[PDB]
Design a protein around this ligand. Structure first.
Ligand SMILES: *[C@@H]1O[C@H](CO)[C@@H](O[C@@H]2O[C@H](CO)[C@@H](O[C@@H]3O[C@H](CO[C@H]4O[C@H](CO)[C@@H](O)[C@H](O[C@H]5O[C@H](CO)[C@@H](O)[C@H](O)[C@@H]5O[C@H]5O[C@H](CO)[C@@H](O)[C@H](O)[C@@H]5O)[C@@H]4O)[C@@H](O)[C@H](O[C@H]4O[C@H](CO)[C@@H](O)[C@H](O)[C@@H]4O[C@H]4O[C@H](CO)[C@@H](O)[C@H](O)[C@@H]4O)[C@@H]3O)[C@H](O)[C@H]2NC(C)=O)[C@H](O)[C@H]1NC(C)=O
Ligand SMILES: O=C(OCc1ccc(OC(F)(F)F)cc1)N1C[C@@H]2CN(C(=O)c3ccc4[nH]nnc4c3)C[C@H]2C1
Ligand SMILES: [Ca+2]
Ligand SMILES: [Ca+2]
Ligand SMILES: [Cl-]
Ligand SMILES: [Cl-]
Ligand SMILES: [Cl-]
Ligand SMILES: [Cl-]
Ligand code: NA
Ligand SMILES: [Zn+2]
Length: 808
């Protein structure tokens, strides 16, 4: 209950929220039904519209006007945005040439360039090119400022998860907003779009920019705008705030447009009805820049024009129903649409079983338009698992489709022609980023980047220290003229041992055999050199990875590869090797098929054993450096050392063998040599972070050999591929993956076919950033290159997406 008897008289859009129940006059009062009786009358004036006309010039101030064209309006800070154009013969901002903004040109008493975030809902990246004829103001921001061809949103590509990721720098799994609709089983509470539950603070985790700014003494305008406040009034309110006295005036502001998303849902992303909403957005940008120009702020403010996600063509006919798959359809709750999330309808149902729900949903129809996953098996690049609000069973829905529980849900709850929410690597879900202002670069294009990185830069723009977040601070320094953040590489925590030969063959009792007893300081001085690091510069191109946690490990050198071998996990953390364009693929000789060899540098006590693998009927083993790529028959024996072996399910060995035997050489051919770093990942609590030894849930039977949940590889070459990967003088090019180590290939519906028809598609789906691997392994890569550290941070956040080029 609000006592709405006070007045908004001189308090319209006041910046401090007054507490219940004195009545409110802010942009949130509508939402709370708490506005004073006279809010509409005083604060939402509309009389005469939004533009000055010639006859209004010099007019006597009438306070009933929505905005003013009288003489004192500039200093009251409430002229119509077109005032100086119509009444003082100025030009519109968009008609002015652009002129580099080398330094902030701010009125006296500004302590820093203000930041205005202009966010547009559903603005698909390709609208920048496709609607460019109708968006002159936006086009000028983009061509004169700093722009990316697109900005990658987070998954799911829904509105609240992405705006709040923009505000926090966090994955939805960490900030808590994991969908537009949620159930938190600890609170036993549901979050919905329609309602009041959603303002409750416990939903909203992390620290959004307005809080970061406030705690560090920088004032913020309101980030939230009520749907019914027109855009023109939002712009006028921001401009009026920008006229407040120094001590009251915020330094950071946000504007939010419901368009073009709102029309895109009804008409599809390129519906003919979409031109008008894009024109209208542009006219709004124009009104903002004209207003800044009248305030002498158009070369002072940094403006970010940013979207939350794109829009895809989706219609009612393209809906999959779970009632076509499950016999038990009424025992589940589905969160439906462009993603699916499934849990039991009642926790009292002891007959509920996820494994049979998943099996019933797996590769059941030839053309099935969704794929089920337990959340821990989703591609690690989605970072969508570590939150009790995310249901264990997830459905990744194909672009252009929906999932629903039953047909009745769709026709008794087409309505719509656009939607979003799909996998955040999908081209239609990509959105926009333009930065313009003194602090951004002039006429500069930057490569695509992810929206989790912006928070850090918004902090940089405002002189704020960012709260702990998922951006990689420094990876976007190339967008900025000044205020760059110059990080130092993290310090290596554990230093390696460099073991020499210390054990005899007969000290090992590993149950391993190898056909290797047929074997001149010619090729004997030579093999000692190799074991001491002599080819190390060929195979370790960017320095050894640093270990950022406390552990005990050994560096092992070989002719064809180098590894960091963990005495704690009994297998390498990393194995590094270079394959030139000219390298040749060989087969394992018949006599060597089952050969495993003890490594006389590493104690039996810190070695795996073949017995454990014999006894474990589920688990087999693979090798990290592949025997097929050995440089010579003699070198091949090194690839069978017990210290290069790793546990692998037979089903996964099909995937790994095709990668090692076919794809590595294929990449070396295409990229002019590659350097590969591969290793194991252990993430049994699915938090995207390396597991300690006591988190490991599965061991090779009867042994202490931990089973990885994933295997990674990072494949680096020269960005200028006329130079070979081992002699590259400039920027690097990388692609990486984090493959899940699963005992079946159920994820791949074509898996009974030859690996040539399905393994590469699987790998593409599990593409990753090098930074993702760093979190998961506690390693830091690329420590010794000839590149700037910021450029290396950018390379580590790179995601190879495999989508075709954005456009047509
Ligand atoms: C992306 O970036 C983010 C941000 O940097 C990374 O997330 C951080 O990861 C850290 C490691 O997981 C984690 O640190 C922990 O902090 C605990 C205190 O946490 C509270 O305080 C902070 C600070 O204000 C706050 O941010 C937290 O907010 C979380 O929880 C609230 C309420 O649920 C949410 O509103 C909010 O959205 C956020 O949720 C997310 O994080 C939590 C984990 O905290 C998840 O459970 C959620 O699903 C969601 O993902 C908190 O309010 C601190 O208590 C922890 O210390 C324990 O563990 C260590 C183990 O060594 C030990 O030393 C301690 O003694 C303690 O152990 C005891 O508790 C154990 C577990 O209960 C118990 O088993 C033991 O026996 C012990 O008794 C820990 O240090 C940090 O909170 C999050 N921060 C955020 C914002 O998410 C994220 O990792 C990055 N992602 C990637 C891939 O890089
Ligand atoms: O006023 C707002 O914006 C604050 C802001 C700005 C920049 C921000 O970014 C940053 F912090 F970085 F500046 C953060 C918050 N908002 C955002 C909210 C969206 N919404 C929906 O009902 C909704 C909308 C579109 C959908 N499509 N499909 N389902 C949908 C559901 C209410 C709106 C009010
Ligand atoms: Ca076995
Ligand atoms: Ca983990
Ligand atoms: Cl959702
Ligand atoms: Cl299989
Ligand atoms: Cl550990
Ligand atoms: Cl596109
Ligand atoms: Na399969
Ligand atoms: Zn939408």
């Amino acid at each position: 209950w609000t006592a709405t008897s006070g007045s908004c008289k001189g308090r319209c859009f006041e910046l401090q929220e007054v507490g219940p129940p004195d009545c409110r006059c802010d942009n949130l009062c509508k939402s709370y039904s708490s506005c004073c009786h006279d809010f509409d009358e005083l604060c939402l004036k509309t009389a005469r519209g939004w533009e000055c006309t010639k006859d209004r010039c010099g007019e006597v101030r009438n306070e009933e006007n929505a905005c003013h064209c009288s003489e004192d309006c500039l200093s009251r800070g409430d002229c119509c945005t077109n005032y100086q154009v119509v009444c003082k013969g100025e030009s519109h901002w968009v008609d002015d040439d652009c002129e580099e903004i080398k330094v902030p040109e701010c009125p006296a008493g500004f302590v820093r360039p203000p930041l205005i975030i202009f966010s547009v809902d559903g603005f698909r990246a390709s609208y920048m090119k496709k609607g460019s004829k109708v968006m002159p103001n936006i086009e000028k921001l983009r061509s004169c400022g700093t722009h990316a061809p697109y900005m990658r949103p987070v998954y799911p590509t829904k509105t609240f998860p992405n705006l709040y990721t923009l505000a926090t720098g966090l994955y939805p799994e960490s900030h808590g907003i994991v969908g537009n609709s949620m159930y938190d089983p600890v609170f036993d509470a549901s979050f919905h779009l329609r309602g009041r539950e959603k303002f409750n603070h416990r939903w909203w985790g992390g620290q959004p920019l307005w809080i970061t700014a406030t705690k560090q003494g920088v004032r913020a305008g309101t980030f939230f705008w009520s749907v019914s406040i027109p855009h023109e009034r939002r712009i006028l309110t921001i401009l009026q705030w920008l006229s407040l006295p120094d001590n009251e005036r915020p330094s950071v502001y946000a504007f939010y447009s419901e368009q073009p998303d709102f029309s895109g849902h009804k008409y599809g992303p390129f519906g003919p009805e979409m031109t008008n909403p894009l024109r209208e957005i542009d006219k709004t940008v124009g009104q903002l820049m004209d207003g800044l120009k009248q305030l002498r702020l158009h070369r002072c403010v940094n403006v970010i024009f940013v979207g939350d996600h794109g829009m895809e063509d989706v219609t009612c006919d393209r809906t999959e129903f779970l009632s076509n798959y499950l016999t038990n359809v009424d025992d589940i709750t589905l969160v439906p649409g462009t993603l699916g999330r499934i849990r039991a309808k009642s926790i009292n149902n002891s007959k509920y079983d996820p494994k049979t729900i998943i099996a019933a949903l797996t590769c059941k129809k030839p053309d099935q338009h969704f794929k089920p996953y337990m959340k821990q098996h989703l591609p690690k690049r989605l970072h969508y698992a570590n939150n009790r609000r995310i249901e264990d069973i997830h459905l990744l829905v194909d672009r252009r489709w929906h999932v629903a529980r039953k047909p009745l849900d769709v026709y008794k709850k087409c309505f719509f022609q656009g939607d979003h929410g799909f996998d955040n690597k999908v081209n239609s879900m990509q959105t926009v980023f333009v930065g313009y202002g003194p602090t951004f670069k002039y006429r500069t294009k930057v490569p695509p980047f992810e929206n989790i990185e912006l928070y850090n830069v918004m902090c940089d723009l405002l002189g704020l220290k960012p709260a702990p977040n998922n951006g990689t601070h420094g990876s976007l320094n190339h967008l900025l003229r000044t205020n760059t953040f110059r990080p130092t590489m993290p310090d290596e925590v554990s230093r390696p041992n460099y073991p020499g030969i210390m054990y005899l063959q007969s000290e090992f009792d590993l149950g391993c055999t190898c056909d290797d007893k047929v074997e001149n300081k010619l090729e004997e001085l030579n093999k000692r050199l190799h074991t001491k690091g002599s080819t190390k510069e060929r195979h370790l191109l960017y320095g050894r990875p640093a270990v950022l946690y406390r552990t005990s490990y050994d560096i092992l050198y070989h002719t064809d590869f180098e590894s960091g071998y963990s005495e704690i996990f009994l297998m390498p953390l990393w194995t590094s090797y270079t394959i030139s364009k000219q390298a040749e693929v060989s087969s394992i000789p018949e006599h060597l098929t089952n050969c495993v060899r003890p490594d006389v540098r590493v104690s039996p006590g810190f070695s795996q054993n073949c017995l454990a693998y014999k006894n474990d009927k589920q688990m087999s083993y693979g090798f990290l450096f592949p025997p097929y790529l050995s440089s010579s028959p003699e070198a091949k024996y090194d690839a069978f050392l017990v210290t290069n072996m790793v546990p692998m399910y037979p089903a996964f060995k099909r995937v790994w063998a095709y990668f090692q035997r076919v794809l590595v050489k294929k990449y070396a051919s295409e990229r002019n040599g590659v350097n590969v770093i591969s290793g194991p990942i252990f993430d049994y609590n699915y938090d995207g972070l390396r597991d300690t030894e006591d988190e490991i849930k599965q061991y090779v039977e009867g042994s202490s050999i931990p089973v990885p949940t994933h295997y990674y590889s990072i494949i680096t070459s020269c960005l200028d591929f006329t130079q070979p990967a081992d002699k590259c003088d400039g920027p690097l090019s990388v692609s990486s993956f984090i493959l899940p180590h699963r005992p079946d290939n159920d994820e791949s519906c074509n898996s009974s076919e030859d690996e040539s028809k399905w393994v590469e598609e699987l790998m593409k789906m599990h593409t990753a950033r090098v930074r993702d691997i760093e979190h998961l392994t506690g390693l830091d890569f690329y420590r010794k290159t000839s590149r700037s550290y910021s450029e290396i941070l950018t390379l580590k956040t790179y995601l190879h997406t495999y989508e075709s080029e954005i456009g047509g």
